[PDB]
Amino acid sequence: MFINRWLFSTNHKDIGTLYLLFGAWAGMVGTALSILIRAELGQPGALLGDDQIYNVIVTAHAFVMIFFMVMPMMIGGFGNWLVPLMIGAPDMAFPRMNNMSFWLLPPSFLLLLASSMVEAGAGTGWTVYPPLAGNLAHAGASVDLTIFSLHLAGVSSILGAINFITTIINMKPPAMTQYQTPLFVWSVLITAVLLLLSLPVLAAGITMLLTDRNLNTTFFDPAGGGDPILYQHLFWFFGHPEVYILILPGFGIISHVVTYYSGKKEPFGYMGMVWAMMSIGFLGFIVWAHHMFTVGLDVDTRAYFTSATMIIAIPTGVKVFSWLATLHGGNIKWSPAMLWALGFIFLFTVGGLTGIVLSNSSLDIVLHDTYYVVAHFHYVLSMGAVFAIMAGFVHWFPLFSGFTLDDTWAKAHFAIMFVGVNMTFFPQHFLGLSGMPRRYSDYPDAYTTWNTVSSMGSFISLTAVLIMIFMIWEAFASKREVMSVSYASTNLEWLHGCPPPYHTFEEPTYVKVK
Amino acid sequence: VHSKPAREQLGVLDITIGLTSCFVCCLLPAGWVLSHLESYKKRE
Amino acid sequence: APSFHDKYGNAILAGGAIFCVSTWTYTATQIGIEWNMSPVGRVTPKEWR
Amino acid sequence: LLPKPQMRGLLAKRLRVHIAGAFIVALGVAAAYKFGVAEPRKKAYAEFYRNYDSMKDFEEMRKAGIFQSAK
Amino acid sequence: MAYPFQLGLQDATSPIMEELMNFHDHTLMIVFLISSLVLYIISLMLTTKLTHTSTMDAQEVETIWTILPAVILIMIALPSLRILYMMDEINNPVLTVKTMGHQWYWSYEYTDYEDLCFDSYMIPTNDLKPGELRLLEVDNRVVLPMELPIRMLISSEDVLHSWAVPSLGLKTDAIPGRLNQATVTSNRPGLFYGQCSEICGSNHSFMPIVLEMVPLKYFENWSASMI
Amino acid sequence: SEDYAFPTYADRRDYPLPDVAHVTMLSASQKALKEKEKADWSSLSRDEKVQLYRIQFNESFAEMNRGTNEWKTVVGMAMFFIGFTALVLIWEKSYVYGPIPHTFDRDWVAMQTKRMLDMKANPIQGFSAKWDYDKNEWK
Amino acid sequence: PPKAASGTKEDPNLVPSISNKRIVGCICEEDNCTVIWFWLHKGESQRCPNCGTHYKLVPHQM
Amino acid sequence: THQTHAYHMVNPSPWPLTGAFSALLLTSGLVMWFHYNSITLLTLGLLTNILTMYQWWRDVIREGTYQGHHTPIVQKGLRYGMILFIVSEVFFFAGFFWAFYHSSLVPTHDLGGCWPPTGISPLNPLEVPLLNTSVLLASGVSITWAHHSLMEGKRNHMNQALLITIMLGLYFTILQASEYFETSFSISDGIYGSTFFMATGFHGLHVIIGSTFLIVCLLRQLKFHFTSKHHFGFEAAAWYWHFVDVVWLFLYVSIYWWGS
Amino acid sequence: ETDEEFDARWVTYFNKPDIDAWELRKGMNTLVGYDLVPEPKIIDAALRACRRLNDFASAVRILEVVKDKAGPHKEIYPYVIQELRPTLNELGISTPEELGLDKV
Amino acid sequence: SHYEEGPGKNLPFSVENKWRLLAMMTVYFGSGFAAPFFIVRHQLLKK
């Protein structure tokens, strides 16, 4: 029974719950990895001896948070929990390959942990840039195990993306148009299109250096005509698309929570919503080399790419301005999710403006691979994606379980998260402006100050994680059921009761004839 | 989102026990490890 | 009066305030850690070789 | 007896006057940043480059003899 | 080469770094402009108490909402285009130097005449002579004359690095089989510091860079007297 | 079991008039109140006004807009837990952190400060701009 | 998609079901971005909460 | 009859989990053989994933063409998913093509500045690669004839169309193996040799996948599985085989017509 | 859209003879959906509907939600008193100020 | 239908005994937190 329903799953609700379980697992694995990183960065000198293991733990940090944490919550878990219950679908189109992607992801987790177990270790960062990960500097099974873990994550993500696109363009009742679905539907559609057209690029690159390692070829060895510039192009033509996969369900989640708790019956400018989302989904590919400005590109293509990033800044600015406009003019219930959303608005704004500051080309000549970039992606991930998924979790938890959290505990959690991330990563702004390069274990006297301050903020975030799992236990122990849910007339996921039953949408909905 | 009274209501005691429970339990790993890092360092 | 936030809110305000200022002053000053606060105005450098 | 007060577009007039306030405070803090740091850098570099002599400056850094090229 | 409680950037050594921080100050003016805008509008709409939950009309603001970002993004971008287009003037390369990034250290060669190469390493903390700098001091500094454009040919031999001198204000990726050009100019004699800025192994933190600016006269004095 | 399908009660500024009343079960005195409601209007007094208001609507705007104390409650417990994190810092400095590097004491920072003013590191605004080289003192 | 677009009082929109409860989604404006979701039960004809078109249930057992 | 929607109902299955575990065993065998020269785990990986993919598709054929849950909307979604997989493989191959184009448009300094690098003798594209194009294009036009004979309803002609397209595909595979035995150098020999050997062998992996799909669709058609219009198995076969036709054409024109 | 037939159609909609609790709830919720303080004749038609449909509590709710829609400024309300005073004592309906529902 | 559904019981972990459930969360998330601790101690032994 347990093996047939859970281990042999075929329903999106249970698959999303097990997504949430594995995502919490990988999330605090990453938290502990970041704490080893930051406690090593808390004291001047080397806490962990050699910095090879420091490179291993920053590699594991990047991998398990980017590929193993927020994609499994937002894309997998929240997508599978919401999307059928949001378009009216009973199930999704291809649930067995959905479940196969699910059951293949923890094998990639196991390969990453085994790569950590290997004597050599994955001392390369998020990037697997050759010839650091080549046959001379990383002769071992750790980097190869990371490459196959990326293979498994990529395969699971491609087949999941096929699942999302088929379950959107298929499972909808026929008379509703595409341009009137909820915003999270558009977010999962555009992200999954970006997945489908981006992950083959990563798979090609990692197979490319896989054949460089084990098949004794020379695709990245310039003594035999190789080119590491080719790997950087392939990897980051994956990377910035994968960035926009990594971020757009946050757009969808906060848009839904804002139009829920702000008293609105609709988001402002839903045509503007969908137009901006497909604009960034379309031209998210042709901006791929803004991470690239100091490898030796031509000046003309540098100007082209920085202009393209200024262009992609334009409709995201339209998105944030219209977020302000859709939270305009309504009663604001002071839910904790609104606290998360407002923190997301501020911190996404400042992170995006910092990203533009990076996007200017000569300042990127000076400030490449520096903690200013760290402050970029922590202001837009460590509180952008993190506050987005906290808002999603504390908003849809009665649908996920049947019980509610404690509002005071959740607001205290928001306060702890907020103060920890700001007085962590504003000293990282100062560190990047002062200019120490990344992936360093020890730092001089000028950097010691902000290193200590931001390390203390990292331990504040540890306290935040502990309070989060405490209130999860508190909710599951108090088990307060929900008598009524507001805005169920406009929210489809909330009208099947908390929680929705096993077999939802047996009869498909009666769409208006028009 | 309105909710009915708690099916089971934790007592100051229960809340205390639990909050501390994880706090300590979740951090204890760090405790044993971070505590003897230098020993661990010993190749011995 | 019947809610928890009437008197216990001010109580936890005072208790948390005292607790945080005491612990954070102790951490900032009473350990012996080095903030590496800026040497401008406060140090007297001496000639080296 | 009281005359007719505003019935329509209260939030509307409030929002236009306060978005105008948003522009004026945004330009105000931009001018604050300028008057604080921006032209001090230009004027400091400028006075440094008139009152600067590289030969003399090297001379007092090399009386200390703290150079690999100076002995 | 940084000072404690640093909130801004390094002071310039190069004129390009000078107008680059002028442009950077312009971008900072922009970021607090937008941040104060969004903060005050958020504060306004959290301090309000009026409700308007009707059907909002849409096709009235998108033209301003797309032309104000259009103008602000292009007037940020045209200084960026100008600075990027003047990174690469016709050079007057009075001096040439090649840097060859080795596994866990650097190599510097002057190869215009009387072929000279040397290897630069990390001074250990116990071997640090008193008064010097941890994680920045190098037993063999690299000398360059002031007030001249000198060409920098950067490459690496086994692992990619990044020769980074934020005091001079540049950072060039050292790639195996590929050398890039960086034109260095300085205004002040003296020491200037940098580091690697790519991941390169189990001593990645321990390849720093030191450039001391001397005249051409003391440059040729060192070149003659080192033999 | 079916209240998610049935119309339900709510109290917010967004929804002034709920579709259903707060109290559905109706006692005999409340049927008397309803037939008095269907009776004449001007003969209906203050107290039956207030219980009819309370049995048809749960709470009013005066008891829905009140500025409650959870903001100070949550900020108090939050910065209490920040103090707990400070104690975590106390323990973590006490146990895993060993000695600082010897390039950090007062002696070494004295020599290195003298050296970095000697080489005049970033003397425009960074460090050496706040130093007088004629009087040998801070600005 | 269904037929008989007629949401008057004398005739409502007929909806077939095999159960006692049934969902409807009103696109009650032309080219409307909003969709209005609500449940109905067997009995009196259900109505739309922002436009007022009427929906009725009929059981069909297939 | 409880299911009122015309979509698909799935009885929970172990086979996604076992396929996932078989992929994990496959990659563990790959690292075990690439580092510790052991073949047992790799053979286990091949046996596991091939068997598991066999009964997974055996289950979907059972539940589709005998039970009958494959609604016209369901194969509408199936053709969506097949198109999605096809275009994902387009961009996979196109990443490989653009890697080749980056390698070849700018020849690096160690190659003599000329494409191909000097001292190697790549095979002439004049005769046997034209044979490859001829045999693959003939197979593609034969399977278009097979689709139109599905439309017409002529069973023996469908039989000969399938027999000739499998005969052509297997002839393709065995001959490209023969000039793998008849090529001047190996995949470990240079940037140019490495890229076209990897690309052509990777296309060879896709064409043996396509040929096996043609084998299985033939054995379905012998068992009277496909019908007049619900013939999505052969639609997927036709789309994949036209895909490998056009991908072969692209790598042909690039590798052979470009720099030889 | 304009004011004259706007509040005219509001008055007629609230003063229809086939009035019901459903559409009074509809009209008042869509009224507070707008960024509008409803005018005395709209409130007059609303209390006409509440009079003919017998809901003292709904009338008190209309008064309380215009208490809410008065905004930060408290001169709107008393103006509502001075132009609706004949209707209140005409019907016997009274205000939350007199009946004590302004306090917590 | 044939599978029991409701609040809490649609989770992979049993809910009814909250002390034992707390034990499950402590061991689960504690092992998750202590995993990279076990990696780093494993190379510090191994190096």
Ligand code: HEA
């Ligand atoms: C959520 C993830 C996320 C998001 C959204 C972004 C968004 C952006 N990123 Fe970045 N980025 C990363 C994650 C992300 N990034 C990561 C993880 C790395 C490095 C990885 C590694 O180093 O290994 C990285 C690296 C990175 C670099 C490399 C720097 C270097 O290392 O040398 C650059 C430079 O161009 C860059 C730019 C941008 C830009 C220009 C945007 C924009 O999309 C931001 C747009 C958002 C806005 C909100 C626009 C602001 C507009 C307004 C506020 C409206 C009003 C203002 C005006 C009208 C002016 N990113």
Ligand code: HEA
């Ligand atoms: C998703 C991406 C992500 C996230 C959240 C974080 C979060 C954090 N990061 Fe991370 N970081 C990266 C991605 C991320 N980082 C990348 C890509 C690099 C560069 C690697 C490279 O150089 O190649 C990097 C580098 C990096 C460094 C540089 C190390 C070095 O190069 O020397 C440092 C050090 O301060 C750091 C610190 C932190 C801290 C203190 C947090 C904190 O915010 C941690 C707290 C956040 C959480 C705890 C998440 C919340 C989730 C849960 C609590 C569980 C979820 C469960 C449910 C929702 C049910 N990061």
Ligand code: CUA
């Ligand atoms: Cu060289 Cu890091």
Ligand SMILES: [Cu+2]
């Ligand atoms: Cu990017």
Ligand SMILES: [Mg+2]
């Ligand atoms: Mg790099």
Ligand code: NA
């Ligand atoms: Na350190």
Ligand SMILES: [Zn+2]
């Ligand atoms: Zn309608």
